[model samples]
Target: VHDSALPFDALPMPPQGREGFEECPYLDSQWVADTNGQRMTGQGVDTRFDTPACVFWSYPEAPQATVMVRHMPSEEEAIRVVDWAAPIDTTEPAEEPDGWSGGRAGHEEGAVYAVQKGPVAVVVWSNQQQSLKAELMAKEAIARLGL
Candidate 1:
């Protein structure tokens, strides 16, 4: 009787565009603002996943950055999440965390970086035009999580 406003692969934001989880577990909120070229207005986290999903805001309406640390059931499922975030045909190859592998792509509108190491996939999106921002986020998340 109702349509899904939120998808299974996605999580919800904080109430009324406010800070969630006090702060993102993997990355510092201030660092996010400085790195992404925006003044962070709010941040939130969803602990449903083993590592949690982090969302940040700056200009409002949409998120300035989003970090997803997915622990899917299998390697194939994990890779599937990375593939969805950064399509191979278009995104550039990403191997930043040394062992992890994925792709990065972005433009004037936004950017996305996704990487997978075994059954864990780390995906990051930035409203900023540079894909590097997303890449850095993905790297930081993976590094802090030690995944």
Candidate 2:
């Protein structure tokens, strides 16, 4: 095995064939579908994270919504994920669940909401047009996970 720091891109990934859980530990499938405004087809979860990562599918090639609850080693690193997902300069303010701060943006194909509180970051990606869809998912993730 090698000993080195993993790149920030190595942060979080969707669950693969043999890994993760069949159901998200925190979020409900119906709730996700309703909020994201997509009919659910399937769902998956990556439990490698402290709060786990949840992905919901809705007939598209990619998951309709993805929620990543990451526990970083430091606050700086936590914000890195937020910055990458929703750049501060290009996105609007995202200060939900009371104490978190970051940004939210709607891109060409979808929308993203990313926020960090201390050393924990919450990032949500939704195929929906409005950034509010992504922000609500991020809010639910933080509230349910108590992060």
Candidate 3:
């Protein structure tokens, strides 16, 4: 856990039934802090989901949910990064060209969505059988960020 408060609380909250998110513990390590420099990585979880839906951010602040909104540098780079996941159900959001892309990882039992907009990059994950709510949350996040 971190000794000081993180800006995670500033992130956009997911829609109804997808609330009550908490930060993941791995990013609090001193090793992560040192290796990350000023950039911070965070993970948020909604344990209520059957398989536990998640949102991950890569940036330098709190609201842990908003981590990606504040640190995305370029859409091209964001695309490249998520491409490494080797997604199976590839998709792109119509609202914004680089907003969210749906994909699936072999190691995970659900679907994952990558958000690349504004100044951050985010990944939202949900069980393969229960992804509607996860996709809804991702769309909300993208719209809220005005991306």
Candidate 4:
């Protein structure tokens, strides 16, 4: 839990009726936890967005999960994430909005996705139930972040 305001106004939100959301700015986090208890997290911020099906950024302040976003500091660092997905069969090059580069990768753990805007990197993982919505959110996030 945190009390600081989060920096994701440009990020896309879930459709109407899917509004059980929460945030902990002081903890540098925000997320939507629906009736089933699913959630997601934020960029460098340390918040849980949803569980079972959520998106999150890796932060040094917390223990890293097998699934979460990775923020990059440069194009070179961005490549590291890309290469990390190189062996995944479902991974493919992505066509970014502008001034960004990234890709989408699918795996049994979750549908892995990654994007980089400027020096920021975001990776997402979602189980089957949250796949569609997760991808939608990630796409919107990439656009909003303009990375």
Candidate 5:
């Protein structure tokens, strides 16, 4: 992802274990999952912060599944979907891959990581599951941001 996508250190993190906490400035620091999605706080924090994470099924030759997510809908539900979709791949991402999120200039099209901005929300889009279900989930997140 582009350097700009990284979360700002000034942001606040979700309280110890509060799920679905939204903190923009802390987006970079928040413990989420990599694009490949393998939750490993120690191995590496969420590097997909503001970056384009891939949907596994969308990958060149990866298995596909239906994974839909709702933004700010319900922390428990969101986590459940993520858990079922694909576990984070805990391998730290590269320093900055060839084509990361819209953080850079060259990559503004066909990006898997879609950013949605609404009344007062920022939603990230990813379809690692690679199915219409995932697309529906992403659409829900976008709709939330529009609110």
Candidate 6:
């Protein structure tokens, strides 16, 4: 989990202590303090998702693509949405492309995310910006879950 937050500028914005939203939300602080103690004045939502309970953090810059991390009531539910699940009859892992940026685990035909079992973390990236976004989101979830 410590690996997740290193790339992001800050932790996921925690709920403001008011009301609304299932999980804590961190609005991108324009006052995003830089490593040097300087605040970043930008016009964007840096951390723009509800929370770990529902959808994981989404980079404010790319709101359309998001990541979801949660524990299901049963492993059966986990196996359903995960597209990378190996066939019960198969005895080996699927082969990966030569230069697949997604590595050799999950498979993405396009925008949809189908996670394979094994790793505790799952990331879904639809585009280049989304790849960065997912990275930030993963960092936030790791920090949030104390991973």
Off by more than 4 A, model 2: 1-6, 16-21
Residue 74 of model 1: what lDDT? 73
lDDT of 5 at 16: 29
| Tens digit per residue, CA lDDT, model 5, 84-142 | 22223521111121221111011122212222122111223332432223333344433
Clashes of 3: 15
Which wins on TM-score, candidate 3 or candidate 6? 3
Off by over 4 Å in 3: 1-70, 85-108, 117-120
Model 5: residues with Cα > 4 Å off, grouped in runs:
1-13, 18-112, 116-127, 131-134, 145-147
Q: Write the per-residue lDDT of candidate 1 for residues 40-146, one digit (tens) a residue.
A: 77888766566667889886778999888777767787788788888889889998889898889988879999888887788899998999899888888877887
lDDT of 6 by residue, 40-121 (tens): 3222222332224222223333223334443333444434324332233322222121211122122232132333333233
lDDT of each: 0.80, 0.78, 0.39, 0.41, 0.27, 0.31
Clashing pairs in 6: 1-147, 4-139, 13-26, 45-60, 46-60
lDDT of 3 by residue, 4-57 (tens): 212322333334322333543322323323322333344454433222334444
Question: What is the per-residue lDDT of model 2 for residues 73-121, given as tens digits with 9 covering 90 to 100?
Answer: 7889888878988887889999897899999988778999989999788
| Candidate 1 Cα misplacement greater than 4 A, ranges | 1-8, 19-21
Residue 87's lDDT in candidate 5: 27
Tens digit of per-residue lDDT, candidate 4, span 31-136: 3233112444332233333211222333232212223334444556656655564334556765454554667654555554556665455555444333443445
Error of 4 at 106 (Å): 3.2
TM-score preference between candidates 2 and 5, better one: 2
TM-score, prediction 4: 0.46
Name the runs in model 6 displaced over 4 angstroms.
Answer: 1-62, 84-132
